[PDB]
Design a protein around this ligand. Structure first.
Ligand SMILES: CCOc1cc(OC)ccc1C1=N[C@@H](c2ccc(Br)cc2)[C@@H](c2ccc(Br)cc2)N1C(=O)N1CCN(CCO)CC1
Ligand SMILES: CCOc1cc(OC)ccc1C1=N[C@@H](c2ccc(Br)cc2)[C@@H](c2ccc(Br)cc2)N1C(=O)N1CCN(CCO)CC1
Ligand SMILES: CCOc1cc(OC)ccc1C1=N[C@@H](c2ccc(Br)cc2)[C@@H](c2ccc(Br)cc2)N1C(=O)N1CCN(CCO)CC1
Ligand SMILES: CCOc1cc(OC)ccc1C1=N[C@@H](c2ccc(Br)cc2)[C@@H](c2ccc(Br)cc2)N1C(=O)N1CCN(CCO)CC1
Ligand SMILES: CCOc1cc(OC)ccc1C1=N[C@@H](c2ccc(Br)cc2)[C@@H](c2ccc(Br)cc2)N1C(=O)N1CCN(CCO)CC1
Lengths: 85, 85, 85
């Protein structure tokens, strides 16, 4: 049980999909992020592993137009930058 | 910020010297244990780096009668078992 | 409470971390030196117990490129060379 504290904007994001805490485990962070992408359909209708986030609050936070769910380190890094760490 | 959550006993120990939260960074955890040990003089006054936790809550929580503050890995481990981690 | 007087060099250093006295108590100093090192990020990233001070005033004061926080007398010996009396 290793918790993290998301910054104001990220916490706003997680909370838009049901999150209710201030600190979370990374597992929870990724879960909520996953749900958010799926819910707002930021993934490519054709190939679901490609995420197109430009034009969304998510794009702002990750600072990239798109990314692959395979790029784990890149993903951990983009989340990192959004952590009161 | 990387937070951990102390089990009830460790949490009493921590709060017995001033702690006021439920989750802490390991830096804050070790800071407090430091104070607890100093405030109760569990350290050997003839070798200040040796800690004798025998017959003390810290001893029941760490499962050792003594240890050196130089055994970092050992200390992180004894602390791990007292974490809802 | 045995107050101590840090030479000009070291005295100026402690100050940089928000210290306000010409004399302190070892417990106070070490706490600050620890703060200096940490936030200054002078420790090996995969072994926080290793301190790389070269390329820093601290290395000057101690006269060492690096050292381990486990080297206790050495850290005392080094601070005793930075103290009046
Ligand atoms: C948004 C679509 O994401 C996927 C697409 C895939 O296409 C084949 C396969 C796996 C995923 C997927 N992997 C998950 C994940 C978790 C942590 C890290 Br680090 C990386 C990836 C996790 C995820 C979490 C956060 C972020 Br950011 C990106 C991906 N995650 C998911 O969100 N999904 C939703 C889509 N489905 C399809 C179900 O058949 C699989 C799981
Ligand atoms: C999300 C996966 O994270 C891990 C996976 C690991 O697999 C080898 C090992 C360690 C971690 C881990 N390291 C933590 C961390 C904290 C600060 C910085 Br700077 C860097 C890393 C911290 C972390 C924090 C932010 C980010 Br981004 C990535 C990792 N963090 C975790 O969240 N962990 C470690 C503990 N475990 C379960 C152990 O019983 C869950 C995952
Ligand atoms: C209780 C005895 O404490 C010491 C005695 C020493 O003898 C020379 C040297 C260092 C310490 C000391 N080191 C600190 C520490 C922090 C993290 C890890 Br992991 C290990 C050690 C930290 C500590 C924290 C938690 C735990 Br468990 C053990 C040690 N801690 C302290 O509590 N200190 C700092 C050093 N001095 C200054 C006055 O003599 C005594 C108090
Ligand atoms: C005390 C320092 O610990 C680290 C030092 C590192 O060196 C770079 C890297 C990662 C960590 C680190 N790993 C985390 C962790 C959590 C669960 C498990 Br199971 C294993 C490891 C978790 C941890 C939890 C409990 C215990 Br016991 C030991 C480590 N955790 C941390 O405590 N931290 C705090 C310090 N930061 C960087 C601060 O600038 C990194 C993460
Ligand atoms: C800056 C990192 O320092 C450490 C790294 C360690 O790595 C495992 C373990 C213990 C310490 C540590 N020991 C403390 C200390 C106090 C008096 C003397 Br004599 C020697 C050491 C004291 C210190 C004081 C002055 C100087 Br010089 C060097 C170290 N002190 C600290 O500064 N810290 C701060 C960081 N934390 C992380 C815990 O998760 C541990 C304790």
């Amino acid at each position: 049980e290793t918790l993290v504290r998301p910054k104001p904007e990220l916490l706003k994001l997680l909370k838009s999909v049901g999150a209710q805490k201030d600190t979370y485990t990374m597992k929870e962070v990724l879960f909520y992020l996953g749900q958010y992408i799926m819910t707002k359909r930021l993934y490519d209708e054709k190939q679901q592993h490609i995420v197109y986030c430009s034009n969304d609050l998510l794009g702002d936070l990750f600072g990239v137009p798109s990314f692959s769910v395979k790029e784990h380190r890149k993903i951990y890094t983009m989340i990192y930058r959004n952590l009161v760490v």
